[PDB]
From a paper:
Botulinum neurotoxins (BoNTs) are a family of protein toxins produced by various clostridial bacteria. BoNTs target motor nerve terminals by binding to specific receptors and enter neurons via receptor-mediated endocytosis.
We next examined the effect of replacing the tip residues I and V with aromatic ones, including I1248W (designated HC/BW) and a double mutation (I1248W/V1249W, designated HC/BWW). Crystals were successfully obtained for HC/BWW in the presence of the GD1a oligosaccharide and a peptide corresponding to human Syt I (residues 33–53, hSyt I). The structure was solved to a 2.4-Å resolution. The overall structure of HC/BWW is virtually identical to that of WT HC/B. The interactions of HC/BWW with GD1a and hSyt I also match the previously solved structure of HC/B in complex with GD1a and rat Syt II peptides. Recognition of GD1a is based on a stacking interaction between W1262 and the central galactose-4 moiety of the carbohydrate, with the surrounding pocket (including E1190, H1241, S1260, Y1263, and E1273) offering multiple hydrogen bonds to the adjacent N-acetylglucosamine (GalNAc3) and sialic acid group (Sia5). On the other side of the LBL, the Syt peptide occupies the binding crevice and mostly involves hydrophobic interactions. The LBL was clearly defined in the HC/BWW structure and is located between the GBS and Syt-binding site. The loop protrudes significantly, with the side chains of W1248 and W1249 exposed toward the surface at the tip of LBL in HC/BWW.
Author numbering:
A (entry chain S): 37 to 52
B (entry chain A): 862 to 1291
Write the structure that this text describes.
Amino acid sequence: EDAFSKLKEKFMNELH
Amino acid sequence: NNIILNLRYKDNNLIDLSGYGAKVEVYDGVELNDKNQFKLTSSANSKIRVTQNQNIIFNSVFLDFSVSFWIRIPKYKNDGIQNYIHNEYTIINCMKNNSGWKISIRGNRIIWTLIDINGKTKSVFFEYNIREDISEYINRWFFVTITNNLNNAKIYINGKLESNTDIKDIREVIANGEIIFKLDGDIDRTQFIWMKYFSIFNTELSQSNIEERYKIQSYSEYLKDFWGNPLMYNKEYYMFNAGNKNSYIKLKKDSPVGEILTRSKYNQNSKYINYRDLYIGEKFIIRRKSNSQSINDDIVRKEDYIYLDFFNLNQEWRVYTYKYFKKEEEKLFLAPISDSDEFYNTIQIKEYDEQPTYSCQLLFKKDEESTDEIGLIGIHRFYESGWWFEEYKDYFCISKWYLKEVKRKPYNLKLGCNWQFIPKDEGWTE
Ligand SMILES: CC(=O)N[C@H]1[C@H](O[C@@H]2[C@H](O[C@]3(C(=O)O)C[C@H](O)[C@@H](NC(C)=O)[C@H]([C@H](O)[C@H](O)CO)O3)[C@@H](O)[C@H](O[C@H]3[C@H](O)[C@@H](O)[C@H](O)O[C@@H]3CO)O[C@@H]2CO)O[C@H](CO)[C@H](O)[C@@H]1O[C@@H]1O[C@H](CO)[C@H](O)[C@H](O[C@]2(C(=O)O)C[C@H](O)[C@@H](NC(C)=O)[C@H]([C@H](O)[C@H](O)CO)O2)[C@H]1O
């Protein structure tokens, strides 16, 4: 679902 | 040219295509493929007999000749290092009336033995290190050439001289016996050897001829895996960085990125051996981007467009780059298969090296059509935390920087954009 949207958000957190 | 025996695959068989028409008997225990690879096992019927043609005129005895072939010698068993180091076994025998040549193996040594009519026996050998973190030689295809003059018995490896013995003390060697390909000695039931492109020449080959031959027998349209076999679509692979040999990729816990960890090592108490573990990190799989193109076989070719996938949580995930990275390097995005406008998923697989290598490069692009380059997949030390003391940490990344470094000649083997793919192989246990 928007589980992929929760990973994209964690990815954005990861690379500043 | 000067070739007098040339074993090549043809119709489920090995045949002499030298033009002298030798007889070749392959017994039921030899495994063959159309890649020209053949396997000798411990089995009584794993053998090849070659009889040189006796209706055409050849030399009774001769001492100016050369033997060329590739070989893949499996890694020692960890609990069998004693027998490996000590127990010599023949792989190829050519002896008539107690004289002639043979090739043999004792653990990490390959040995070339001459014997004359009188019974004088002289050897030259090539030993590779079994303490290396990552070997160029254990369980990997390499190219052997043995030349013989009156003076010198030389062994060349991958086109480079390595060993020399004085053989002036030997005047007379019978070189017209049956050539028997067979494992012969106190071997483990599990012992085997792969060979390809076995050739004999009636001359001592120049270093220049041996290196030209190494380069031609190395060339292919298709890329190769860590072991030196063809790279395949739809096959599970571990990933090796030639630029960070002791590095491996692992999905960060609760974060969709690849952290770079340090390979675990041989942990038992043998003083004779050491290696880095190879079967660690994420399990990757290569997929063709397009199915509308012709795809008869599953072989990965230079310039092919691929997805680079891996297995996570019993699901096939994919490697992406974020589209809008202003920086010179960015962490790759490791996440489920998804049509997302915010990420590229398309990789072209390249070979920027012009020397023989098993390494390949991974080029992110917009589309199969788009002609502009986003960056090459590699590894980079990123700022992690700290103000007083600064913590840095390696991550699986893309980099524009690599695009300039791949153009410098001679090709920089040390770049972290150089990858090999390692599948599980019966010749490597850890
Ligand atoms: C060392 C470094 O930081 N390199 C990064 C570089 O940094 C710039 C400055 O350094 C040079 C340099 O690279 O040596 C200085 C040279 O003089 C320049 N070259 C020339 C021709 O003179 C060179 C140029 O950048 C290039 O020619 C092209 O641009 O830059 C560096 O001194 C400076 O330092 C910072 C520092 O961070 C601050 O704390 C400090 O205040 O001062 C400055 C200000 O910030 O930073 C400069 C950049 O701003 O910059 C480039 C980007 O242009 C890269 O980040 C580069 O690091 C390399 O990144 C790539 C990915 O892009 C890889 O991560 C490289 O690491 C690996 C790899 O390839 O995977 C790891 C491997 O283990 C290693 N091989 C080994 C060890 O076997 C390889 C590497 O290819 C080989 O070591 C080389 O053969 O590198 C990483 O090096």
